[PDB]
Amino acid sequence: NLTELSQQLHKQLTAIAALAEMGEGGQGILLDYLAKNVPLEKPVLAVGNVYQTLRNLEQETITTQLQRNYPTGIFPLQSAQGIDYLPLQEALGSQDFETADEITRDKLCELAGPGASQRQWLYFTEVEKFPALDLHTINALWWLHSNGNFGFSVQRRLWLASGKEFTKLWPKIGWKSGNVWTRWPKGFTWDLSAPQGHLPLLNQLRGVRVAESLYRHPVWSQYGW
């Protein structure tokens, strides 16, 4: 039974869900799966789902073991500018998407430099000059810890599937409901019941220029997003 479920890891989510509900046996299988695939070299959703499913059990022994074996998560926290992405990983690992959103916004300004860090918002030109590596790390964390539901890559593909029309994009990802913009922060859905691409948020107070620059950034094609 359990070995059959083990082979389903390589549809994958159903097996993962089943294993986690099967006591020490199934969880032992999940834990062993991480040991054979962590650290990731490329983002693999199954690995993210295994880690997050185990985290979601909220059992002390599992959580402690995960924190001990994988203190920085399952994905290398790489930065072309030496930025620390652990607080982001920790927020996503705790499924605190609201905090993760806040951190991501702060990290993008930090990535852009002292100018954006001071004014606390971005210019589209700064977005164009973002290093691909940092965007990859940030997006991977969102993607891996949300069953592929969240991430700029997710928003970008929906945008492409909308003929690059932002007015069609907003209702799909829940940032607009007809003629009314979703109100920050209470109007947004900070959990996995949110629509595909709902997070991270990109404030439209200053237009779509930042968003478009981000979606058109070479990182997505370069890293196979």
UniProtKB/Swiss-Prot annotation:
Gene3D superfamilies associated with the record: 1.25.40.620, Gun4-like
Name used for this protein in its record: Ycf53-like protein
CDD domains, per the entry: GUN4
InterPro entries from the UniProt entry: ARM-type_fold (IPR016024), GUN4-like (IPR008629), GUN4-like_sf (IPR037215), GUN4_N (IPR032192)
Recorded GO MF terms: tetrapyrrole binding
Family designation: Belongs to the ycf53 family.
Organism annotation: Synechocystis sp. (strain ATCC 27184 / PCC 6803 / Kazusa)
PANTHER family: TETRAPYRROLE-BINDING PROTEIN, CHLOROPLASTIC
Pfam families membership: GUN4, GUN4_N
